[PDB]
Amino acid sequence: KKETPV
Amino acid sequence: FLGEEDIPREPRRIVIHRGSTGLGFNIVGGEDGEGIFISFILAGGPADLSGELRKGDQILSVNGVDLRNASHEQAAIALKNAGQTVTIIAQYKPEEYSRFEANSRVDSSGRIVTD
């Protein structure tokens, strides 16, 4: 899926 | 004026001094060596304040660590754990990026448009 904030 | 100048597709080095705060951008990709792409830059965050990253940039490495082929979780780890001064090498890869976001395509200057 997927998006991650860093 | 600026918007029908081609966006450079060559690799750039970007140094971001964020202390023990967030970088202020989100990434997508990382399945099967697909690559890691910036999807969202937070307004006012360190990545925005740099002026040198945009959505559609590929993260090619972080502090010397090569991420072209990283998994998503291991890219995110690298990014969060990279330390206070974070040296990114990015390359704008708008066609590749555009296949992650709905209804989005790349115009003649290489800017990503979403209809």
Side-chain angles (χ1 to χ4, degrees), chain A residues 2-6, chain B residues 2-31 33-115:
Chain A
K2 215 199 343 58
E3 220 220 49
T4 289
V6 301
Chain B
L2 279 203
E4 273 159 71
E5 312 199 340
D6 306 295
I7 292 145
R9 285 153 171 276
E10 108 126 86
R12 309 102 50 198
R13 194 189 292 94
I14 299 94
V15 180
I16 281 171
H17 307 298
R18 51 67 176 279
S20 311
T21 74
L23 289 174
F25 71 84
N26 291 356
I27 49 144
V28 296
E31 260 101 88
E34 180 119 51
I36 297 307
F37 301 83
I38 298 182
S39 48
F40 173 87
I41 310 225
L42 176 78
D48 172 23
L49 300 199
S50 81
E52 293 157 54
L53 293 169
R54 74 161 69 238
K55 191 176 73 174
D57 284 328
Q58 199 181 348
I59 297 322
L60 300 182
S61 57
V62 90
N63 292 351
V65 183
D66 175 15
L67 296 194
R68 295 169 294 138
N69 293 295
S71 82
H72 183 95
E73 209 214 343
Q74 290 295 312
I77 288 191
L79 281 158
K80 297 169 171 209
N81 285 282
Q84 297 172 243
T85 288
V86 175
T87 303
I88 292 159
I89 292 312
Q91 183 162 36
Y92 183 55
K93 287 267 161 167
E95 287 77 20
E96 282 103 313
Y97 171 78
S98 72
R99 95 178 56 204
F100 289 98
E101 200 171 338
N103 296 312
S104 93
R105 55 200 179 74
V106 187
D107 81 3
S108 140
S109 68
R111 285 162 160 95
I112 288 151
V113 179
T114 304
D115 304 282

